[PDB]
Each structure stands twice: as structure tokens, then as C-alpha cells.
Amino acid sequence: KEATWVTDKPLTLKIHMHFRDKWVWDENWPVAKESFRLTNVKLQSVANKAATNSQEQFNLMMASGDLPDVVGGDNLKDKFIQYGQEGAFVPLNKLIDQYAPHIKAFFKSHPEVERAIKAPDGNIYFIPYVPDGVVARGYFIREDWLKKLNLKPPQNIDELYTVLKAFKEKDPNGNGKADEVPFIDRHPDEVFRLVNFWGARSSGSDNYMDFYIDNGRVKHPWAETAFRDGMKHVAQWYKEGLIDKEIFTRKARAREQMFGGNLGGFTHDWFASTMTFNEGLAKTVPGFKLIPIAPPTNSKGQRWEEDSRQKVRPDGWAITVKNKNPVETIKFFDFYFSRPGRDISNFGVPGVTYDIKNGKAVFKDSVLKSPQPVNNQLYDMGAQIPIGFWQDYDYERQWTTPEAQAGIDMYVKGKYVMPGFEGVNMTREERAIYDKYWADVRTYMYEMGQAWVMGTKDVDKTWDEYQRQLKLRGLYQVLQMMQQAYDRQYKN
Amino acid sequence: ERLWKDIKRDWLLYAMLLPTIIWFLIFLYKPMIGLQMAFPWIGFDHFVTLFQSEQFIRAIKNTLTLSGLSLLFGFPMPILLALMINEVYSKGYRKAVQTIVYLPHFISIVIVAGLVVTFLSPSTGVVNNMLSWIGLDRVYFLTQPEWFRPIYISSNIWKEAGFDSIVYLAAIMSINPALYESAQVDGATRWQMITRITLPCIVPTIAVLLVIRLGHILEVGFEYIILLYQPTTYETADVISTYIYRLGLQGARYDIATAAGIFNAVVALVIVLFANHMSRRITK
Amino acid sequence: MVASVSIQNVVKRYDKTTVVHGVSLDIEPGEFVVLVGPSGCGKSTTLRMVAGLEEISGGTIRIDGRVINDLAPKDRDVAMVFQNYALYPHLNVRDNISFGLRLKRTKKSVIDAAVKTAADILGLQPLLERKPSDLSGGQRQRVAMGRAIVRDPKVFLFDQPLSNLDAKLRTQMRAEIKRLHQRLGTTVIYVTHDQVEAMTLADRIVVMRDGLIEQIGKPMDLFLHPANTFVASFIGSPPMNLMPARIAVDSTQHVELNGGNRISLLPRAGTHLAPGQEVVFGIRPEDVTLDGVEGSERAQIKATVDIVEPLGSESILHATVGDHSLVVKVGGLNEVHPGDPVTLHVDLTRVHLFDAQSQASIY
Amino acid sequence: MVASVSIQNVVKRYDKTTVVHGVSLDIEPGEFVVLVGPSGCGKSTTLRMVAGLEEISGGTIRIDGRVINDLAPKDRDVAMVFQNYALYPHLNVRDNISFGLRLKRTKKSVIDAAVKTAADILGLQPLLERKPSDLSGGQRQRVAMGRAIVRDPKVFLFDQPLSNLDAKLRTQMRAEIKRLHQRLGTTVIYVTHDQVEAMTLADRIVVMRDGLIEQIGKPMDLFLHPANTFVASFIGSPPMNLMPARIAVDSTQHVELNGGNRISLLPRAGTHLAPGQEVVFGIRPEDVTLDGVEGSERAQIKATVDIVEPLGSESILHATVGDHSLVVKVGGLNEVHPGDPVTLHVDLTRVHLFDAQSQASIY
Amino acid sequence: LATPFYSRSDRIFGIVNAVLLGIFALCALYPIIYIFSMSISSGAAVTQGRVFLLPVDIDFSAYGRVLHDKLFWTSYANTIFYTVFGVVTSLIFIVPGAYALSKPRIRGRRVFGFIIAFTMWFNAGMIPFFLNMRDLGLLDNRFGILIGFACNAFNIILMRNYFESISASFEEAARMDGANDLQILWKVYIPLAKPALATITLLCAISRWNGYFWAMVLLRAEEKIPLQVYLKKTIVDLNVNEEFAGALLTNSYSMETVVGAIIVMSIIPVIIVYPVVQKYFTK
Ligand SMILES: O=C(O)C1=C[C@H](O)[C@H](O)[C@H](O[C@H]2[C@H](O)[C@H](O)[C@H](O[C@H]3[C@H](O)[C@H](O)[C@H](O[C@H]4[C@H](O)[C@H](O)[C@H](O)O[C@@H]4C(=O)O)O[C@@H]3C(=O)O)O[C@@H]2C(=O)O)O1
């Protein structure tokens, strides 16, 4: 028996969690075993580990006539609300109030977060992933390549064009070949973020292709005329070979390939994990120095940082109507908002990846000195996964290096980070419109943008038809619904 | 009458026929009633909804296109391979060719796809490398909608053309030599032979195989496409079978899908009827 | 178009085997000559060597002055009728005949005339627009022959043309072939495994066994005076009897076989056979009669009846003499009744003897 | 055993088509009877109906007193020898022979005596242990017969057994069948497309043209007095010559042929002839001779020599009279020259006459 | 074809024929020897200019990765199961089924034939088949995969054709000896049908081994996954865990080299049995 047990008799539940198009829940995970030990609740995964697309798998599960006891993953928020309203998911409100003191307290101290996860009916159908921190992504460049080529860090877009062109052309990696790739990212969408240099938003938040607000008016960054003029230039950059050709494909291995292979000259990514590589590959790539830079002055004469760490990502887990133990499950969920739960869901397992020192969790030296980023290590273990849990920034601070920290402070002091878009409150009726057209519209937008980047389609020629397609596919209808949600709340 | 007697006699034998008939009813004929259901009833409207899609109409427009290319390049190739092997002396050399040419058939379609993606990858794939050797620069193949069909039909001939050549080869092997020897006495030439004897004698085989080939003509390249089609190639690559799959299974839209499936199936039956007619009529 | 083919020491070798052993035969112009023997002898292999369908591994053959070894079948002035159905199933009969000529074309008029001729000969005129799919096997072989005579060769090559035909058709076609040779008169080499077609059709018969050539001569030469025991057993409607015998007391007079029988011999000067000499005594079934030969002046053979198979106005009597049985062709019935004893009377002028070791002709 | 099979009005119908029309045959015990005819015919279907491989759609057929119409082939007490040899190319030869008796009955069946006998009959000592994939078609058919004779049935059924065998082998096996029926003696019905085997093997022959049954009688009965033009042209080693003819001025005296020819006729009885009657004159090749040797006069005929095919001590002469040709069997190896006229002396006793319409024998 | 050599219009033609067919043969044999070498080569070698044909820097490292992959061997096991047992079920449903279909004493010979054959030219289509699989309770089920696809019309009419080709005198003789139906089928007609049996068991075999679509559609549980599905994940999709990204740097194999090793380990059993298969049919 343990003091954190939510049940006397051991309880085993069926979870469907397939997330980030990469991982599924593993009951054989060390963190899962620890969670079972402390909660007396074992979660057994039912999902295809051979599957690729996670969203697809969720949609298939919901239509298969049988639901598991718990469903979890990333970017299911809208689906949590929809299928919660349709009865696929149970309201957790009474369960939280009676059986979940930690979550209840959390929501009391965070009315904004709770508001963000609520459905139009006022119900909470899932327990969210709650991030901890302020800044998220920043621009990183190779200082050693700048020094070998005797170049100064670019203060502006033009200077960066010239620098990436120098990266493209004469041997920054010194192998006598043209093989070098100036810009790389593990996230394809970041290529669109390049439009920031031309004065266009690619998003309103950390969520890609999210809406934003300008002067009391709701806009989508991709539907704006400025976006066209920026995308022209990014398509030029791809055409000139400055952007990684595989940027839409390569994804999760990108850094490891391009930086490890000494091909990559520039990126835009999270401070900590990006800075880890300086220590990691320093033996394989002797001169490698990757440093944080302030965003270059863009064409509009401003310094934009579009990304920030957010409050309540649209990720987490929910309890189905077929779950025969709702109380035990809500207690179990509440565990992850307690101290021990946060400890295992953040730091992995004690005696393995971390120890308790002075009442705080301290990573093992074996973990900290590993060439692989700590968070990746944790993913592979079942930690830092988008279940309902409360993130602890200390976990990240432990592997955050001084240069990284100084980059963070540089971005904080300069106020470069743009205000993030938190959301709007729709009623049951209008949200139906949103949910009907939005996923497909977003898909279409992505496809089009990818067509433009790779140069398979001319942006200028297709812009008109693209706008028309946006209207006929219901984007602007959704936009009016979003606006009607906005103007009621905020007046003066 | 006669029946009962026979049956009383044609049982143990009549027993064997039953499970096969049970099977066909259950896994084949029972789904046709499902055809009838997914066809709260109606219906015939989502047929006109399926009629109007800018993505769909281009999928049939792509379908019959790919059918055209597969008929042009794909079909005559195993006949060609058949004739070319039959003209080979040297015994084992020919043998050596056959084992080489037949082997790709046994390579799985998904593995074929993987061979393609690994060969055509930019900066990695051997093909692009060989292009960089002679100064052809590089091309990212799977993303380009221009390259989809050539890559496909070519990979398909590589995989299936020899195994498909086997049949025709056997057919031309079944011709009694007397036709050839007597032709040689009159002084025919090898080309004169394949044009004036081998091909005309093998025609009934190629006509029969063509009407089967036409039977599936609308489903050509399904597993390949479903594997390799990227967003940028969605336009050229998407075919009726794929559309049906995406909406019906993936997108979980059944009725509209099943209906599209009907359209496809009826058109296939029609084209195989129109095939078999002209075939049996004109060729023997 | 009447020409002579001489074949000198021709030998075929496939791998290590050497199918034909250096066969040599000279063929007079206008002559109908038949190669005949069992299966596996070089009959077809030789014929095809003439045609150019098989390489000549040694020796030379020539038509008239031309040595055709390194030549091509097209240029060898030959036409061949094969064993199996050489017509093409898609083409009509007219096109089947005209095929070879349409290889080089050069006009439709010339080939029209040629086809006119050939069709008139084989009576193929009504069959012109018809198709091989529906034709008699004999009709198929007729049009196949039309293919050959439209080439107008120096030599006609026949490889078992009649083999796949039924007997009824075979006798008819055989007659047609003879008649045909009368009409045309072109030199022809004809290959058969059937003794009958050889005896009937051939001016000269050359019998071959296992790559070698056993004997040559007019049909009646081979029939009356076979070089060896094999040629004796081969030609003729039933087989010649040929049972082992001996000599004993005296020589040129008496020959005895296993049945405790003794046969006096007509002198046939130049024979010189030794007393006691191991020998095989042949006699043909037509040359043996029943007791109606009146008392057997020379004291003829004794036998016991095995079976009688009635056929025509004739009948085949199987009698046994000692450990061996002789077959005699008698009239078209009679009581006989197998199991009783019987006395046969041998014609003394038609008897043949062959040595046991050397299978040659002796008497 | 020795048993009697009676067949009464046996008829089988496929769809609405009646294959055999009211066939009735009574077969004596130990009698060897042969069914014979054209290609498609109810001989194989009748035999099969006896065997029980085909159901009886009408009429009754019984062996001894037992009616076999509705019965099991296994219980039909019959053995059948197939054309296709029907032997399992898996089991040993001895195992194929003992197969039928080894289904049941081991240990006190003993099986050894029967297989000893059957082994001696077909004379196979070494062939006891073998496989059908090895042994030749002749030996395959031998052991095939071994299966039947080891069964010890009441009736032997043979459907064209040696049809797929070669001629040289066919004759040998024919003799073996004769001898076998003499040695064993079980009742046997034997189906053939070949006239020769019918003449040789049958105690009684029954000829069936498609549909009904054409004729029944001893071989010599069918040879001497054909029921119709078909029985005449079908039976005999060469065909009986058949040519159109007439009568004119008087009847029982003269019958006239095509070109310039008339034959005095022997009157006999039961003839019922009549002047001017359209008629076909049959005569066998052996029943025509050369010019007369003895003779003479009103029995002669005038022709022109077409072709002569030497067979041996015999020669086949094709003589043209009118637009039609008749074939005579010559005692030749003598000399006749084609294209000149020749005289033929017909045996007056052996002539046959058939009505042109009725197609049946008047004389 | 024609034995005796001769004409120029032949000789030149024949040579250029052997050359063209040769080049084609080389093109067809090229990808197989490539990945074999590429699987053996080193990540750094394959990543830029090398290989092209023969190995280069070796190191043999990717194979370890695949050898320690549990899903790989699991899936291979699944496929061996599906091919063996799938073939057996197919045979048990077809061989006797076609045997009955061959004998034309059957009343249904006309109509049963139409029933079977009609499935060739008309199918209910994808979705109806899947749904009928759903309400038969066969989804995510191995027996569902076995019994789901066993009978093909082609294999049936082919089998019945080779049966019909055999002279009826064997069955007739058997009946004469008392053997009835089934006991004939096993005793005589089956050992006579060995070539057709071969072609069938072969076609069914490859159908099971290389089958992808309906497996990945009808299966959910990963432990039931049959190779080519899992293969679809690793070999084509090509997006991976941060785990594999981290394994990349500590190893010196490549993504490409691992892929190569994988498709090699996938095609080896086929390259092995293949001559045996061909040697049979190529007599
Ligand atoms: O890198 C760090 O230092 C770091 C520190 C923090 O402790 C925290 O763990 C943070 O985790 C990040 C992680 O670094 C990646 O940036 C990750 O990227 C996600 C992204 O957030 C989206 O969830 C994205 O969703 C995809 C989905 O996977 C499918 O592909 C779908 O088709 O498209 C959606 C989409 O809208 O993009 O997946 C990305 C991914 O997994 O690569 O985000 C986490 C995070 O916690 O936010 O890293």
C-alpha cells in the first residue's frame, strides 16, 4: 500500500493514447510502472504502435463502436469539446469538486486556464496539459561558422539573407563541397514563421496557424495580404536553396541530422533542447558553437518574436462514458496535479533518472550529461507526455545552460515576445460552425502553403483563387463567429 | 426425380462444393447486401454531391488518365519481354535473365515504394546522386506532381513486367515448330516471323489477358498511390479508388464512399463487357 | 526443276552423340526415294540436313553442282512438307499457300497465278477462302503441300507427311502422292517409319538403322533379297518368320530347325554354306501353305496350331514349331481349331537363311 | 465365372437426345462378342451401361438372372479395361493388381494364387515390383488387364484397349487377347473402331452405326454377306469396291457398269431383282483378277491402269473403268505399266449388289 | 526457336536483342544489389556521394538495430503464421471445391459456376467488404484475416480446369473398384494435379506474404501486425521518434542504412526460396 493510492483493490484501465504522430502509451514504461505503483492504477494501451497519424487514429477509435476507459493525446481539445457535448466524454466537474482537490485548487488559482479548457456548455470534459515557463522558441545560429567566415551576426533581414547566402555558397563547413543547408527545423511550420522577417504573422500563438487579434479585430495570419508578400520571399529563399528541401518531411530528426552532420547553418527552436547540442556533439563536430540571437530587424522596422510558452496547451486526457470507474480515474488524474505525480510526470523515475534533494527533484548526472536532450529522454520514458499533468519549469531549468539562460533573458528583457492569443468563448450553436469548417480549412491552408514554399505553385498567380477558396470553404463564416465571441466579452 | 438420385449419388462430392459456396456467399455475396444498405433512407443525392467535388472529378479525370498510361506503356511490355527472351539462344543465359526479370514480382508493393522513396530522396537517394555526377543537378521527385506517373508506371514495369511476361512466353512456346521451320524454308526473317506468325498466333492469349487487365483498369496503382502520394502531388496522384478509401475508411464517410464505389464498379463491369464483346468478336 | 542430289558421307553430331554415321546416297533426277526405318535412325535428321534445318556436322551433300552445306534453306531450291500441320491458323488457305511468296512480295499477279496452279492441282480452289480451323487433316496436308509446290523446288522433302493421319486417310493420301509424282515428276526424298508407304511409293528404298544405312534397292529387291536379318524382319506386310536352325549331316541339301523338322534345299549355286553352321531360317507367311500342297515331296515342316485370326478372304494362322512359333497366311477360313497338330508345306524357292553371328544373307 | 449377359431394349437419353435406340443383344456364356463402328457411337455407351458407369434410361440388362440396371459397379461382378489404361501411377504393379481385392479381405484372403496366375498369363516375373510412371504403355495395358483378370468377374469389358498402342504392339496384344480368351474363357464384350480386331477376336461381331444396331453375326458372316453398303465398305482389309450400276434388257442375267461394261450374273435365289434398277455393284479386291489366267469371257471387264502400289509378294492395282475407280489385289511383283488398258476377271460368285436408295443387299 | 543461324538480318537482330535484354536485366537487378551493399555500408558513406553499387565503409551497424527490434520479429512471425495457415485454409476451401466443380454431373455446375466466377468482374467494393468484416466480428482478428481472404475465383477455375483436363477414366476405374468420391480425390486426382497444386499454393503464398492493405485496415492490435504493415511505418512514412534520432548519433548507422537493412531482412527469405520455386516451373 502507498499513501497516494487512489484505490485499495488494484485497477487496470484501457487507454487510447497515440500522440504527436510518434508515441503511444506503454504500460511497460518506467514512469507508467511508477505511476501504477503510486496510484494502484495500471493503464493498458489499446492502440496501433504501427500507426503514424495520431488524429486519424483518434477519429477511427471514436467510430469503432468501442471506447477505452481513458483517451489521451495532443491537440484533442476541440475534439474533447465536440465529443464531450455529444456524450462520448463525461463531465469531470462534479468529479473534480468532490474527488479532485488538487485540480479544483489549480482551477481556482487559474480561472483563465479553466476558462480556456471549458466547453460552451460550461463543462470541463478533459484534464489539460499545463506548461510552465514564459519564452518558448528563439533564433539560433552558428557562431563558429560566422567566425570561420569572419562574419558578424546579422542585425537585420538583409544581413541574414547575405549570411545564409554565404552559408549556401562558400564552405562554411569546410569540406570543399556545396552540401551545406543554411536553414533547418524539426518543425516544418517554422518555415512559414520566416514570413516574420517580412512583417507577417504565421500564427497568433504557440499553436501553429492560430488566430490573432489586432485592434479589437480577429484576423487569421494566413488570410492576410501581407502574408502573400512574405511568402513570395520565403519561396524565393527555398528556390535559392537557403531553406532545407526536406523541411516539410524530415521533422523530428532534423537537428540531429543537419547539425550532427555539420550541414545546418541556422534554425529557429526552443532554447534549452537546442542549446544541449553544443555539449552533445562537440566531440564529433569539434568547432560547433550554436548561439541564441535576437530576432533580426524585419522589413517593417520591428523586432518580432511570434512564439511564447503558453498556458494550457490543447492537450490532455478525458474519461469516456464506457469507463466503469470514473471516480478512481478522476482521483488518478488528480494524482498528476499533486507533488509526487508532477515529480514522476516531469522528472521520470526516482533512483533511475532523478533523486530527491532538499525536497526538490534533481536529475541524475547521467541524464544531464547525455548528448540527447533531457526532454527526449523523458518522452522515451513516459515523462513530459501530453497527459493531464502540471509541468514544472525547474525540470527544464536543470538542463538549461548559461548561454541558453542568457538567450532567454535577452528575449525577456527586449520584450521581443509577442502577446499570445488565449481564446474566445463560443456558444453551442456557433462552435458547431467553427468545428465543421475549421479542420478542413486549416488542412487546405497547409497544403497550399507547402505548395508555395517548394515552388510547385506560384503564390502570386494563385492568390486570388486561394482567397475565393477560403471564402467558399467557410473560413470567413468562422471568422464572424470568432468575432461575435470576442466583441461581447471585451468592450471597455 | 433425376436430381435426388444424383444428389443421393453426388453427395460426398456435393459436400465439398458447399463450404466454398458458403464462403462466397458470406465474404463476397453478403457484402453486396451492404452495397444495398449504405447505398433513414435516401440517397441518390450524395451521388449528385459526389458528382460535384473539385477534388473528385479530378480523381476520375486522373483515373482514366492513369488507365491510359498503364494501357500504353504497362500492358505491351510483358509481351515485349516475352518475345525478347524467346529469341535468346545460349540456354542458361536466358535462364539467368528470367530469374533476374521475374524476381521483382516477389518484392512486396510497400517494399517497392520504399525502394522508390530511398532511391529518389534528394541529397541521399542514389538516383539524384548519379544526376549530380553528370551535372543534372537534383530533383525532389515525390513532391513534384510532374514526376508522379513516370515514377509509378516505371516502377510498376520493373516489378511486374517479367512475371507478366511468363504467360505470353508459354503461349509462344506452345506453337509447333513446323510453322517456324516451314517459314524458314521460304526464307522468313526473325522479325518477319514475330510479325507474321508469333504475334498473330499469340493474339488470343493477349486478348484474353487484356479483358482482365481492363477489368481492373480503374483501380490501377491503388496501394502504390495510397503509400506515396504527397500533398503537392494530391492533384495528379489521387484516383477514384484512393478517394473512396480516404473518405470511406480514413475519413469515415461511408454512404458517399460506398456510392462512389458503385460508380466505379458499374463502370468497370461496363468496360469489361465492352471489352469482352469486341475481343471475343474480333479475336476468335 | 528436275535435279539430282548426292549425299556424300553426311554425318550429324548433336553433342557427343553423333546421330548419323556418315550416310552416303546418290539420288537420280526425277527419282522418288524413301528413307525408312524404326524411330531414332537418322531418317528425319538426314532429310533436315538436306533442308538446312539442321547443320551438317561432317561430309558434304549437294544438289546438282551446288554444294548446299553452307547455303541457306531459302536458297537451297528445296520445299518441305512437315509431319504436323504447317499452316497458320489465322490466315486463309489462299494466304497460307501464298505465304512464302508474300515474304518478298514483288507483285500480287505472279503469286495469284502460282496459287491458281497449285490450287488446281490439289483441288484446293473451293477451299481457298476457308480457314485451317475448319479443314480435314488430309485437307490441311494438301494445302501444306500446296505451299511446297508453289515454291517450285528442285527437290521435294517429305517428313512423315502421313503419320498423324488415320489409316483410312493414309492409304488414300499415299495413292494421291504416287499419282502426284506421276503428274509433276520432281525429285523427292520421303521419310517414313511405315514399311507400307516405302514399298508402295518408292522407286528406290533406303532402309536405315541407328544412324547407319542398312541397305538400298528397289522395293522388290529388299523384299526378295534382304541384305540381313533386320531388313528381312522389317519390310513386308506381316513379319518374315526367321527362326533359328542348323545344318548337320550334309550341307547344300538339308537344313533342320528346333521342331524336329528337316527341310531339303534347292541348290542356288554360289551359296557355299558349311555343315553344322549356326543359322536362322526365314520364310514369309505367304510362302507357307497348308497340307493342300500334296504330300510334301521334300518332307516339309510340322507344327501345332496356337490360334487362328480370320481377317479377309485370307486368315492368319499362328502355329508353333518347337520353342518358337511361325506365322503362316492361309485362306480365309477353315476348321483348323487351335490345339490339334498340323502339317505345313514350305515353298523351297522362297526360303532365306542368315548366319547367326554375321547377320548377312548366306543362302 | 462363366455367365450369360442379356441386354433388352437398352436405351440411354442425353437431354432430349436418345443416344442408343432400343439396343437388344443376348450374349452366350463364355462367348467373345465385339461391338464395332464409326467414331461417335453407342458402343462405348452400351459397354459403359453394362459396367454401370452410366445409368440405364430405358430397357433392362441382366447378368445371369441378376438384373443389374439399378446396382453398384463394384457389385456388378464385372471388370473393365479402359483405353486410357486407368491405372494409378502411384501404387506398385502388384499393388495395382491386388488393389480391388485388398480394400477388404486381408489375412485369409491370401491374394497369392490369383496374382501368381495373372503374373504367368501376361508373363511378368520381373514386372511384379514397378511403377506405372516407368513401364511402357504396352506393359501398362498388360497389367491393366491383370487388374481385371485377377478380379475373377463374370464378364470382361474392353473399351478400345489397344487403341493408344502402336501397330506392331497392337497386333501382338491382339494375339495375346485371342490366346487369353482361349485359356481363361470368361464372357467378354469388346468395343473397337478397328475392323481388323473385330474380325480376329470376335465369336460374334455386332456392328453399330450411330443410333441403332446395324448387323450381328460371325466374322465370316459379316464378310461374306453384308447387310448394307456400309457393312461392306467398313469390313475387309482393303475396301470392297462399290460402283454405280444398272440392269436394262434382262434382270437375273446381266448387270451393266459405267464405261462400256457388263457382267453376266449368277441367278441364285431370294434375289428379287428387276430391270433398270439403280444399283451399286460391290466386289472385293481379292475377288477381281488379272485379264483372266484361267477364265473366261462374260465374267471379264475392261479398264485403264491408273496406278499400281507394290506391297510385297502382293501388289495393289488401281483400275479406272468409268469416272469411278475400282481396286484389285494382284499376285504381282509382276509387271504392269500405268496408262495402258487392262482386262480384269471378276469372280462371279463373290459379287455383291445393293439398292441405291435402300442401300441394302439385293444379291 | 530457330536452330540454324544464317542470315545477317537475323544475326544483327539477335545480337542487339541480347544486348537490350541484357541492359534491361541489369536495370532490374540493380536496386537489389544496391540496397544489399547500402545496408552493409556506413551511414557517413551513404549520406553523401558513395556506394553507388558496392559497399564502402561497412561497419555492419544497422542490422543490429533491426535485430534488436521486437516489432520486426513479431511481425515477421505474424506473416509466417498468415502465409502457412492462410495457404492451408485456402487449399482446404479450394482444392476439393474445384474438384466437385470439375465433374459435370452436378446440377449446380451451371449456376454454382456463375456464382463463383461472377465475383471476378464485379465486387461490392472496399467499404462494403470492410463493414461486412465488422459485423462478422472479424476485425482485429487473425482468423478474420485467414478466413477473410481464402477463396479467389481465379485459383478455383484454374484448379477445376486442371482437374477437368485429366481423363475421366481414372475416376471411372476407381468407382469400378468401389472407391467413392473423396477417397478418389486423395488417392489419385490429387497426386495427378501436383503442377496445379504448385501454382496455387505459390500464388496464395505470395498473396499472404506481400499482403498489406486489408491487414492494416482490419488489424488494430500491434502484436497481430504482419510485417508489410509495420514495414509501411518504417520504410515509407519515414517519420520517427526523438528516440531514433538519438540512436542515430550514438551509432554511426544512418536512417537510410537502417531502411536498407530492413528491406534486406524482409526480402531474404524470398530471394532464398525463389530459385527452388523457379527451378520447379522452369523445367
Ligand atoms: O524543447 C524543449 O526544450 C522543450 C521543453 C519543454 O519542457 C517541453 O517539453 C517542450 O515540448 C515541446 C517539444 O519541444 C516540441 O516543440 C513539441 O512540438 C509539438 C507541437 O507542440 C504540437 O503538439 C505538434 O502537434 C502536431 C501533431 O504532432 C501532429 O503532427 C498533427 O498532425 O499536427 C500537430 C500540429 O498542430 O503541429 O507536435 C509537435 C511535435 O510533437 O513535434 O511541443 C512540445 C510541447 O510540449 O508543446 O520542449
Ligand SMILES: [Ca+2]
Ligand atoms: Ca559542405
